[PDB]
Amino acid sequence: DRSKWHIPIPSGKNYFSFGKILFRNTTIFLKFDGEPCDLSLNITWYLKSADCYNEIYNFKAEEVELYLEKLKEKRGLSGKYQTSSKLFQNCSELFKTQTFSGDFMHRLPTAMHEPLQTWQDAPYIFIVHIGISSSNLFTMTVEVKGPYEYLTLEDYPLMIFFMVMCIVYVLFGVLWLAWSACYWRDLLRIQFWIGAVIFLGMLEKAVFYAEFQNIRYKGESVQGALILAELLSAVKRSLMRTLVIIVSLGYGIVKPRLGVTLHKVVVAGALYLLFSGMEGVLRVTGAQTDLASLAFIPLAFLDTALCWWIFISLTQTMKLLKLRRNIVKLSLYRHFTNTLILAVAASIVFIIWTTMKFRIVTCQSDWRELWVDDAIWRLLFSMILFVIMVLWRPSANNQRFA
Length: 402
Ligand SMILES: CCCCCCCCCCC(=O)O[C@H](COC(=O)CCCCC)COP(=O)(O)OCCN
Ligand SMILES: *[C@@H]1O[C@H](CO)[C@@H](O)[C@H](O)[C@H]1NC(C)=O
Ligand SMILES: *[C@@H]1O[C@H](CO)[C@@H](O)[C@H](O)[C@H]1NC(C)=O
Fold this sequence. Notes:
Elements: E1 4-7, E2 16-22, E3 27-34, E4 40-49, H1 54-57, H2 64-72, E5 81-88, E6 122-133, E7 138-145, H3 156-182, H4 189-218, H5 226-249, H6 259-266, H7 271-285, H8 296-324, H9 328-358, H10 376-391
Antiparallel strand pairs: 1-7, 2-6, 3-7, 4-5, 4-6
Helix pairs in contact: 3-4, 3-10, 4-5, 5-7, 5-8, 7-8, 8-9, 9-10
The structure holds the ligand CCCCCCCCCCC(=O)O[C@H](COC(=O)CCCCC)COP(=O)(O)OCCN and 2-acetamido-2-deoxy-beta-D-glucopyranose (2 copies).
One 2-acetamido-2-deoxy-beta-D-glucopyranose (NAG) binds at residues 89-90.
């Protein structure tokens, strides 16, 4: 999420905690700036490694004060940790105690590791507590910097994946543009909708990559980038679904362009955008009003209805084409049906695997590939889009589908 924090000290209970997966040899910097001191301060910090990812997931800030005691009485989850505490009589707002010239303090469940560093890439929990000895007085700035300026783990693979996807979509666009240019005398609206889909995918990937670059080099995410990416993704998915429905219905390929076919039937099927969008932005906001739990039910219902309709229509159209004795289009429709079947099977298998790999054990022992749940869908969509592109490639005899 973030790699730089600003915290005015006199707030709440003064605790500051964060849990996240971190690289190895990552340093944590604390800086204190503000008005002249009046009172003495006592700063205590804990940095704990986590063996398995459950602890980070179910870490509640409001109970941190209690959590610590469970850690101290030797009853918490397994994992080594470092603890330290220092006392300043008026203010050490200029000293560099946490910067350099430190000592080697032993770790607890010797070691003699660096004062404030990560000794192994894993899920870490950092807690800092400021006690003032007897309205703002200070403003603590906290940063984490590792081998990469601000890009923690769990984000590096995602950034690389988005870069690769951007390159792939650029290649898709270049190839489609070349084919279209070669044969411009005749074309079909489907070959324009495909290009629009490619363009939207390119824009989504570019936005995501730029946002990740900014987060890496500045430590803060851009406020209005996730929303834009989600909206673009929803638009692209809705357009692809509508295109598939139109192709299956045979509108303009096997039957005359009847008006009723679109009106009240297909275009209304664009409400799938709303729901698809509705959850999207909410997922960015964190599901604060917890409707995210009751958000995917309408989406699943709509997807089931659309699949049922698509398969019924495909069977009807293929039967009609076989009866008509046409041969050229029959092979194309057969390949289209096979591709759809394979996509459905892959989606089912992926859902089963994710469910059986995440909600199956007390706590995940393999958090490294925890990002795959947010990347398989995009790869599958890219594969489907490439197959469709190859099927409907403009050619010299691009008139068999009048
Ligand atoms: C309260 C305790 C129980 C709760 C389980 C909550 C798990 C969170 C993930 C939800 C999920 O399981 O994901 C959804 C898939 O449907 C399902 O629900 C799975 C089968 C069940 C059918 C209702 C949404 O994903 P989608 O929009 O279909 O993916 C397409 C996107 N292109
Ligand atoms: C800071 O608070 C701790 C409480 O854990 C207590 O030992 C003392 O007041 C301070 N610690 C020092 C001065 O080492
Ligand atoms: C703490 O000691 C004095 C006493 O008030 C204070 O003025 C100063 O800023 C702090 N540091 C030192 C070295 O005196």
